[PDB]
Design a binder for this molecule. Sequence first.
Ligand SMILES: O=C(O)c1ccc(O)c(F)c1
Length: 167
Amino acid sequence: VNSFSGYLKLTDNVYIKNADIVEEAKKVKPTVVVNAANVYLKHGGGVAGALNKATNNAMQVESDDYIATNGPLKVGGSCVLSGHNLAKHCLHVVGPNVNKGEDIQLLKSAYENFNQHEVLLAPLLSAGIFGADPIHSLRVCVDTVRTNVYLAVFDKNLYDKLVSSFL
Ligand SMILES: O=C(O)c1ccc(O)c(F)c1
């Protein structure tokens, strides 16, 4: 049994809810929240800007030190950093950004990072400002992630379309 409430069950291991990820993390304090990161860990908009704003910019300060030491992530890759006031840990995962021309086949590689964690609160990778089709992102999630994932979908309209169209 875990703390997540109000989710619709899609599969054995994937759950979904219409919720602002910033507010869900604050309520649950999950072991892992996933950030929709870029390779530079520059958290300016979308899930990253909102998560980072909720940490009062402490996520960005920590991230800048990580990049200064290690250099940029790979598209499809990840790193584990602090969850600050939102979670124990933040798993920063880089999905491909269609608005930069990145290979959508890298979305499966991105979701494979989730399998290193037993339970996660996450957004749909490569959705929203990353430019991918969220229906596709949910299909790749279900077909790739084997650990227990609780997906927070920001837009109510999109949430209802993802549920209604789910195979
Ligand atoms: O899921 C998203 O796309 C999401 C969530 C919260 C935000 O503030 C945002 F800009 C985007």
